[PDB]
Amino acid sequence: ACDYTCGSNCYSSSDVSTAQAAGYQLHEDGETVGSNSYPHKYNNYEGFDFSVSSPYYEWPILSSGDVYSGGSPGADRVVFNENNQLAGVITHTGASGNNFVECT
Ligand SMILES: Nc1nc2c(ncn2[C@@H]2O[C@H](CO)[C@@H](O)[C@@H]2OP(=O)(O)O)c(=O)[nH]1
Ligand code: NA
Ligand code: NA
């Protein structure tokens, strides 16, 4: 039962909660991991209608169930704000160029 579906990936919100929590922790600390330095600001160039207030930050969500720990970010991301609220779940899967679509 998919709370969020990114392409073929099935995410529950515990799955989300867990990804989120780690990214949020590193955001707060002023540190990043990976060659892409996650977490980092998500601009919302795509213009998604998130309810949550900005600034937004993106952190990879792993199809593997595993919390991102520095390798490939994959195509999926968790977006959260400074108050640590979940903004949405987006993915490169299904989007053209280097844009993102929302996970459903
Ligand atoms: N598609 C997309 N990429 C973003 C967004 N915010 C930040 N980024 C991207 O994240 C990377 C690290 O900041 C950059 O390649 C890229 O931004 P740029 O196009 O602005 O350079 C956004 O809202 N959408
Ligand atoms: Na730093
Ligand atoms: Na392409």
CA nearest 48: which of 87, 80, 19? 87
Which ligand has an atom closest to residue 97 CA? 3
37 lines ligand 1 (CB under 6 A): no
What is the count of structural domains for the chain?
A: 1
Other Cβ atoms closer than 10 A to 9:
20
Q: Which CATH number covers residue 102? A: 3.10.450.30
Other Cβ atoms closer than 10 A to 20:
24
- Measured in angstroms, the resolution is 1.8
**Would you say 84 and 52 are in contact if contact means Cβ atoms under 8 Å apart?**
no
Q: 3-state DSSP: the chain helix, strand, coil percent, rounded to 5?
A: 15, 30, 55
Query: Which neighbouring-strand residues pair with 60?
Result: 77
| Domain carrying residue 103 | 1-104
What technique was this entry resolved by? X-ray
